[PDB]
Design a protein around this ligand. Structure first.
Ligand SMILES: [Cl-]
Ligand SMILES: [Cl-]
Ligand SMILES: [Cl-]
Ligand SMILES: [K+]
Lengths: 358, 379, 358, 379
């Protein structure tokens, strides 16, 4: 899946054409097209959990926006496709607008129907058989939590309860015709696990930055590689978690163990669960691993280096200001706000012109 | 909910969904790495008595069509896949795979861990198995049927699939534009080839017809004498299922042809029979070769070709007679793939030159035959 | 199907509800539902040939209008339902909005698909097999004509060539368990014909007014009934063509023969073809048969009473205007017009206020 | 495109579409005017060796369900309809009609002028025909097979559909709310009825059970002696296929029951049998009675009831033994519909008091039977 950054380019034409405009890309592997695809959506780092809706069902104007989005593809077309199915459009109707092969389209429609059932059945109806079936189709605990109106953590706990975890397959170039000594893996919901983790070494896990985008590029991958290189050299078993195909970090050569996976809490905890690493590094892959820090820690992950909390002190502009204040250092006239009214009030004081920094 | 289950000899079970006919299938379980070409594979006689597993998870994306059938029927004993797609999506499709399978009364199962199966087979070697598709499929029963299967080793299958009566074949190869051509008038084909049907593939003949060869297909157990009497321009030995060794009749006959100067060409089983008839030995492979990305070296010219392979038996190089020279070898494992008689105009290939499905890299092998025939005609 | 007159009541609420708003109704008989429905559509006299489109295929806002029309029924719903199928909505999608049983819906979707085929293959693709299949699903020559971008008279001709004419069945209360000596028939495309026309007498055909509506009501039924009563009494064999169920004219006692059919050119021509009547009356059923006159006569129908040219002299405003002049009679200051600009110009002349009379 | 064809003895051809299993079907062709209850009709044993034609064009609108089965299987020889709906649309639906027909292996045709067929049969009376569904149906072969049909005239069909071993029924009637109830415990059933199985509808039984009887179903050929030996509180004679005439065994036995004071009740065939056993005569009607809109008069109360009919044969009124008194007649053709023994506690109904499908109008006919029974018990 390609990664775009149109929001950074306000007056830009954002319809897709024959002249590339994407900034990076994500890649996913799955035993099935649906599984592969859903994993890619969630690995894209755009805040999706799969096919999150873009328009409300009760929008009267909705069918018009959708048609627009389908007929003239923008970067979000993929989501609008699932919205079209939620709205009653057929595979043929969508095909006619998009020209996307029905082979694919039918698969997305099927997912939409599954979503609908989960919504209806809620958490209560998420029985092991069903849950399994959904996991098998690439559903993220988070999307499932969204639909059932619960917390992602609840879905996760449920899976645990049902002893529902993915297995890891390996890439080998030959559809298993030959054995492999390399460990380039991917998750799936199937029978046999081929992960066979060591018990032998002290492991360090490095979380990559997913797809490249503006502000988060190759620099981050360069660091991840070095971390991997340096530690391995030091004698640690290195484990890389990343899904950017364009990278050296995703090159089998780079680490001892490579999990070509979405850099999500879900995906990472599943890995952690079998590797039981000594430490996990979250400061070398950009914003993504940084935002997950607290959640990982909360979940029992041995995050090493600057703590999620310390990270928080800096990442959180009120905490930081605080600290600076604590150190008796110089900062400009500022304030920390959450609502316009307060911000509007808060700005008269400080003074113009001012800098809005999230 | 339509239950199906696959039980191997060793007792391993694969639970899934029935996508074909109801009932039971028993045979040798094999794995094929072909990403495309499932129909052609299914209708390949060489699969008679074999339960076919496909490594590529989505099987049926293109539906089916008659043009993609390599024989009158589906020979594969059963089909095992990971995922059966919701729809077929191809201009050439005339019937979705599932309907196709039911129509041919094929027991098949989807939704299983084909990779796990694959690894097992690769690792422990070929096993026989049994698929039971139906209401409450009985594992013990499938198990028992898989253990009770006799095994392909030493099983003559060519006799089981061969043509009752002999016949003529004058049709050429398919084209996008044209499609399957119309049969050619006898007078239109310079050459005349006698082809022994050991369970031959339509493309082989089509490809022969394509080279201006006129064909007469004969039952496998057809006498050399009977054959000679037709004054063939050359003879051809078809592929086919099971053990080539027990095929006394064909070997014997072959020996006969070799006493003559007629040019002979064999493919797969044909290759084996021909080796056999030259005093070479055959052995059953660990898991065999089934797929379409198989590298084969033309040792003479030191060139590689990506080939179509489908064989569970192979010719022992070590036992090779001095009158037999090696022409080709697998790059994957080193096994024997091609041979040529030092003394007679006879050669064969292990892989499938005609492909269907698969790469066209081997097709030239045919041409060499044709050269041999022309020269016999000179004489 | 009910007959409405919302166009006469501008500021009215035109959404259908629990209080009646319709003014009339049409009824149709067909061997199949598809057949039944289509006949009714064309028998309604609202300009439909069957499922004529309401919105354009290339109108961005089209799905939105459809949506509305489906969600909140208007008198136009049935046509919108077809437009919805053309637009890419599924049966389910339609059911959700309409609550109309899918048993009916699929039927309409199927006619749409057949319609799209006609549009693709055109007049060339109209082989007998297909054409026959089309006639059987109730398709009118007129609808086929627009789709095939040809003239209705061309389809009718094609039908002729092929020997594609309907048969007539009889109404009998028992599903043929018993014979009937009554001639209450409806047209269908089948094998056996039960028309069994007289050769015996001189026939007179009366064409009915179709559904009641504001402006054309019961008066026209009363006249039809009387014409039959009269002529019959006079020794003529009387044939009634009408499809208004609430009428005495559609009563089997009323005439010798009753064809419970839509009053259209196609439908009338077929009966005429078989009845071979002495004459046809087009003057007692409202505007309908009045508009059909020319076409009927032109098609060999023996129209009795005031002629079609004569009717046109009176019905055409310019022609009427002349007549008055030629007669040296008095009429107001007026002018006949076809375009605004000219109208505007002429208006200046005549002077306001002024009456606009089509 | 899947063809089908229906050929009548007279040479009349109906070409249409195949909607059920592939093959041929031969029987006596009949028309049924029911607008609803096609499944119930299909699973009615009295239809055995009969090719049923439905007058109501759209058949299959509600799909099918198990509760709507009147027997364990489909008895109709064939199915002839005008139109097979695109979809089945009813909450009770479990399987679309086509599927069901195929599953039951029923040859069925669609898209023909059923009306023209109806008129023919009504006009010229019942005829045997043949339906061939398949690739190229052979009109001359169909005719041949139709022509070759024996004829239900003098055909004992009762023996063919009856139960192998006698059995017990204690199951009640269906409810919207509860569906099909659970079988009752024998002890919950006051009365004990013995039922001859001449190819009985489940609804007869259920309705009986419904009225407090515990049943014991016996094969058609069972001996009165064997019967009497169980001490039944009442005997009942079911519906069924074929000529009632030929059934000497049952005739004989019924004669034997009428010597005793046991109450007896016959429905349709049972009606004919009992009338036979009373020395009356049975005829084969022109086209018979098949529908669910048949007016029948209770001559006694001069009250009309709409009924469910299905009968190709009838009892001659002008040959009725004096001991036989007419309770009911058909208002459509004045045929005999109900009789009662003057002397005995034995009566019968030509139609189906149990409906399924059809109007509930005649269900009280059962009540009489219960009166007769509680009376013999008082005795
Ligand atoms: Cl209003
Ligand atoms: Cl066509
Ligand atoms: Cl017909
Ligand atoms: K027909």
């Amino acid at each position: 899946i390609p990664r775009f950054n149109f929001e950074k380019f306000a007056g830009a034409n954002d319809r897709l054409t024959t002249q590339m405009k994407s900034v990076g890309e994500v890649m996913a592997i799955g035993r099935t097209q649906q599984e592969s695809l859903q994993k890619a959506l969630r690995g894209l780092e755009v805040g999706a959990t799969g096919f999150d809706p873009k328009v409300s069902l009760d929008d009267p104007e909705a069918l018009t926006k959708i048609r627009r989005e389908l007929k003239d593809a923008g970067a979000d077309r993929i989501w609008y496709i699932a919205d079209a199915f939620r709205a009653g459009l057929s595979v043929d109707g969508v095909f006619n607008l998009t020209n996307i092969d029905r082979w694919f389209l039918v698969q997305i429609e099927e997912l939409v129907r599954l979503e609908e059932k989960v919504a209806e059945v809620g958490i209560t109806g998420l029985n092991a058989d069903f849950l399994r079936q959904l996991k098998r189709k690439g559903f993220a605990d988070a999307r499932l939590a969204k639909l059932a109106g619960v917390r992602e953590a609840e879905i996760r706990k449920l899976r645990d309860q049902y002893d529902l975890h993915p297995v890891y397959k390996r890439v080998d170039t030959c559809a298993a015709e030959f054995a492999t000594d390399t460990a380039y893996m991917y998750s799936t919901y199937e029978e046999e696990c081929e992960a066979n983790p060591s018990t032998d070494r002290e492991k360090i896990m490095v979380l990559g930055g997913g797809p490249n985008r503006i502000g988060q590029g190759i620099e981050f991958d360069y660091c991840c590689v070095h971390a991997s290189l340096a530690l391995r050299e030091d004698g640690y078993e290195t484990i890389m978690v990343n899904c950017n195909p364009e990278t050296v970090s995703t090159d089998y050569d780079t680490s001892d163990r490579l999990y070509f996976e979405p850099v999500t809490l879900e995906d990472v905890l599943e890995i952690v669960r079998i590797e039981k690493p000594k430490g996990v590094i979250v400061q070398y892959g950009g914003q993504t691993p940084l935002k997950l820090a607290r959640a990982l820690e909360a979940a029992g992950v041995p995050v090493i280096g600057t703590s999620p909390d310390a990270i928080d002190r800096a990442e959180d502009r009120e905490r930081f200001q605080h600290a600076v204040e604590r150190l008796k250092l110089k900062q400009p006239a500022n304030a920390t706000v959450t609502a316009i009214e307060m911000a509007v009030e808060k700005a008269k004081e400080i003074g113009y012109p001012l800098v809005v920094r999230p | 909910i339509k239950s199906a289950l696959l039980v191997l000899e060793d007792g391993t079970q694969f639970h899934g969904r029935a996508i074909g006919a109801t009932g039971s299938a028993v045979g040798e379980v094999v794995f094929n790495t072909s990403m495309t070409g499932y129909q052609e594979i299914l209708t390949d006689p060489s699969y008679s008595r074999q339960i076919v597993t496909l490594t590529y998870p989505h099987i049926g994306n293109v539906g089916t069509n008659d043009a993609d059938e390599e024989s009158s029927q589906v020979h594969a004993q059963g089909l095992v896949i990971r995922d059966l797609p919701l729809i077929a999506s191809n201009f050439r499709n005339t019937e979705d795979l599932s309907s196709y399978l039911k129509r041919h009364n094929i027991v098949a199962i989807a939704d299983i861990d084909t990779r796990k199966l694959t690894r097992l087979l690769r690792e422990k070697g070929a096993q026989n198995g049994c698929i039971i598709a139906g209401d409450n499929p009985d594992a013990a029963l499938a198990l028992e049927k898989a253990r009770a299967f006799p095994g392909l080793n030493g099983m003559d299958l060519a006799k089981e699939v061969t043509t009752a009566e002999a016949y003529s074949w004058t049709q050429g190869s398919w084209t996008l534009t044209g499609g399957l051509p119309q049969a050619k008038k006898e007078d239109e084909l310079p050459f005349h080839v006698v082809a022994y049907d050991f369970g031959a593939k339509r493309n082989i003949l089509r490809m022969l017809v394509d080279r201006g060869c006129r064909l007469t297909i004969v039952p496998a157990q057809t006498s050399a004498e009977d054959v000679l009497k037709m004054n063939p321009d050359g003879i051809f030995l078809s592929n086919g299922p099971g053990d080539p060794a027990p095929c006394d009749y064909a070997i014997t006959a072959i020996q006969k042809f070799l006493e003559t100067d007629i040019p002979v060409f064999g493919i797969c089983l044909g290759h084996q029979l021909l080796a056999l008839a030259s005093g070479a030995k055959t052995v059953k492979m660990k898991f065999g070769h089934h797929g379409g990305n198989h590298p084969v070296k033309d040792v003479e010219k030191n060139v590689v070709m990506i080939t179509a392979q489908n064989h569970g038996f192979a010719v022992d190089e070590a036992t090779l007679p001095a009158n037999l020279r090696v022409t080709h070898k697998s790059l994957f494992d080193g096994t024997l793939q091609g041979i040529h008689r030092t003394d007679k105009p006879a050669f064969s290939f292990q892989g499938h030159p005609e492909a269907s499905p698969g790469p066209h890299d081997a097709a030239p092998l045919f041409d060499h035959f044709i050269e041999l025939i022309e020269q016999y005609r000179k004489t």
